[PDB]
Amino acid sequence: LKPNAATRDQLNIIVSYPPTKQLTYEEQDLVWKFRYYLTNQEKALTKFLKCVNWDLPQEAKQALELLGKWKPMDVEDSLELLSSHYTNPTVRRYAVARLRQADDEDLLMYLLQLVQALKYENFDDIKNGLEINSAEIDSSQIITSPLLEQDLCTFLISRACKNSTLANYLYWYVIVECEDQDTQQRDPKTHEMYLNVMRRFSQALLKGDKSVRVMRSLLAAQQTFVDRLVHLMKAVQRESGNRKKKNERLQALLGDNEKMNLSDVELIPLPLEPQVKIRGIIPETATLFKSALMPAQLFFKTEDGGKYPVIFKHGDDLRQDQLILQIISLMDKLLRKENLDLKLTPYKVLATSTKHGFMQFIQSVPVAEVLDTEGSIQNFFRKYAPSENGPNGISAEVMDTYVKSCAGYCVITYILGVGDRHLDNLLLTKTGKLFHIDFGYILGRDPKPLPPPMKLNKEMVEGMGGTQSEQYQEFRKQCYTAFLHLRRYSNLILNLFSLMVDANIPDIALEPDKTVKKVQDKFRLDLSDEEAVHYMQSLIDESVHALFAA
Numbered sequence: 001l002k003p004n005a006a007t008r009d010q011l012n013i014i015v016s017y018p019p020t021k022q023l024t025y026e027e028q029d030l031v032w033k034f035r036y037y038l039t040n041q042e043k044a045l046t047k048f049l050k051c052v053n054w055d056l057p058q059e060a061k062q063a064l065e066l067l068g069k070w071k072p073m074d075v076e077d078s079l080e081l082l083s084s085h086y087t088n089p090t091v092r093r094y095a096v097a098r099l100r101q102a103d104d105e106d107l108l109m110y111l112l113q114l115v116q117a118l119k120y121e122n123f124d125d126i127k128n129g130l131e132i133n134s135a136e137i138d139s140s141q142i143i144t145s146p147l148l149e150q151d152l153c154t155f156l157i158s159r160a161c162k163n164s165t166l167a168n169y170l171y172w173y174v175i176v177e178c179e180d181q182d183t184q185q186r187d188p189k190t191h192e193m194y195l196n197v198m199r200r201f202s203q204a205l206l207k208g209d210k211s212v213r214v215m216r217s218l219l220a221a222q223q224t225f226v227d228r229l230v231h232l233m234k235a236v237q238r239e240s241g242n243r244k245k246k247n248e249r250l251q252a253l254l255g256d257n258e259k260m261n262l263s264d265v266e267l268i269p270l271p272l273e274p275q276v277k278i279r280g281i282i283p284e285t286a287t288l289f290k291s292a293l294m295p296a297q298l299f300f301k302t303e304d305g306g307k308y309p310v311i312f313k314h315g316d317d318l319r320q321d322q323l324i325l326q327i328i329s330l331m332d333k334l335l336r337k338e339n340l341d342l343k344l345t346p347y348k349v350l351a352t353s354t355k356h357g358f359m360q361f362i363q364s365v366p367v368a369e370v371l372d373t374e375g376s377i378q379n380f381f382r383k384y385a386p387s388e389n390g391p392n393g394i395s396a397e398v399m400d401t402y403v404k405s406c407a408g409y410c411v412i413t414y415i416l417g418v419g420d421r422h423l424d425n426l427l428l429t430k431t432g433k434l435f436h437i438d439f440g441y442i443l444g445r446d447p448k449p450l451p452p453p454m455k456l457n458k459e460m461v462e463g464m465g466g467t468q469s470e471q472y473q474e475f476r477k478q479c480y481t482a483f484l485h486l487r488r489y490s491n492l493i494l495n496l497f498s499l500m501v502d503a504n505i506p507d508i509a510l511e512p513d514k515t516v517k518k519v520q521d522k523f524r525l526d527l528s529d530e531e532a533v534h535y536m537q538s539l540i541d542e543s544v545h546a547l548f549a550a
């Protein structure tokens with residue numbers, strides 16, 4: 001029952017293994033022998049369930065007995081049991097039981113991955129939860145046409161019926177999976193499941209009280225607003241002529257409220273940010289971007305009489321950008337939790353389908369435009385935010401914001417392996433905030449062969465006041481600090497990426513088995529905290545030396 005000091009130390013090495021590290025048959029036989037001892041440690045549960053052969057009924061039964069007696073696992077470890085690796089229904093009920101203890105704030109951060117976990121859930125239990133050919137059921141028409149106890153589908157709907165923000169995101173995350181043409185063709189049973197999830201969610205909203213019934217009518221109003229906006233986008237993209245002829249069509253159709261109903265609507269929540277209620281799109285200030293993809297810049301009239309600028313794209317998959325931005329939002333929240341605000345810009349991204357979606361426009365000037373107009377980053381900051389007492393004639397608040405945003409994004413783009421990095425993707429604000437846009441290349445993927453691991457640039461270093469400035473010393477300091485805090489939440493970041501292997505993300509579908517390993521290698525879990533600091537310092541030293549030696 002109780003192992004000796006040598007075996008106790010040997011079991012600790014097995015528990016300390018990174019998520020990718022697979023246990024050998026003799027290694028998992030040792031874990032199985034002392035399964036009753038390991039119940040006192042919550043971190044051992046992940047390693048014990050790796051030993052079990054789920055095709056063997058008694059081995060699965062014995063694991064379930066130990067599962068109930070084991071120390072209550074963390075929310076980050078519960079996400080691993082909802083992945084492709086664990087298809088046993090009882091295991092998934094215990095994973096759902098731990099999410100029930102977690103707050104709605106935490107549940108929102110993993111919601112995109114929780115919708116993806118439905119793929120591994122029991123499809124019959126989902127269908128038999130309702131009180132024809134799958135093509136006959138249009139997902140967009142479900143909400144607009146009204147007539148260890150809980151599983152993942154029952155839990156997500158139950159929590160959504162209580163929280164309006166959670167209901168908003170759960171709706172649009174399921175709608176995208178329904179509209180997924182790849183899932184519709186390669187596995188119709190998965191497509192049918194997502195339709196039943198939507199049909200069950202619509203049914204539970206109608207069954208609910210006055211405030212619950214109001215939620216589905218607002219969701220129907222959001223879908224109708226989106227469907228009309230898509231029809232507007234199609235007509236503008238199909239319009240023969242230049243950008244000016246297309247802009248005139250966009251402004252005229254938006255203004256015609258009797259035909260399109262987009263300029264004047266009742267106070268409805270914005271699908272991108274449900275906390276922000278909208279009056280409609282301003283027709284006179286809506287124009288298309290210079291891009292061939294034809295994205296539209298739309299200004300939304302808020303409840304408070306403000307302006308919410310958005311980038312509504314049509315004919316492009318926002319799914320890859322949606323994941324990266326939700327990970328940046330998680331990483332920012334994790335860094336803020338450890339009392340380190342690196343002034344990051346995790347702009348809201350919401351796909352309304354696999355073909356169309358919204359993007360939160362942040363008032364910023366790209367570094368390419370900054371160089372073409374002002375010459376350098378420092379000249380731009382000295383023009384819009386000057387101070388004589390501050391460093392290099394630039395405001396102390398703005399410079400501090402710049403150093404933190406440069407250090408913050410340097411670590412994040414390194415871990416996420418963000419490729420195709422040029423001055424048009426690097427965006428700068430008048431407040432100091434530096435951020436990355438257009439995440440078309442991630443997890444080592446890059447159009448150029450042999451890309452650098454750290455995406456540092458000569459202009460970023462020049463903006464800090466050189467390599468000898470006290471701002472660059474702060475950059476190095478905030479770089480290893482950000483790396484140390486993110487390494488502490490490595491299990492959380494990797495388990496969410498593990499739940500995204502079957503998601504139709506172009507850069508994940510390329511190498512699904514290697515996805516988790518790609519992120520894990522960047523964290524350098526083989527090295528200690530003190531070693532990780534010097535490795536981060538070595539990455540900066542190498543990148544800086546390679547940059548000037550162009």
Ligand SMILES: O=c1cc(N2CCOCC2)nc2n1CC[C@@H](C(F)(F)F)N2c1cc(F)cc(F)c1
Nearest residue numbers: 289291295311347359360361362366424437438
């Ligand atoms: O994915 C994104 C996100 C994004 N941002 C803007 C800042 O807030 C966050 C969202 N902007 C853009 N893109 C795609 C490429 C272009 C396009 F949309 F115009 F094509 N675009 C863009 C790029 C610029 F350099 C200047 C500009 F005004 C728009």
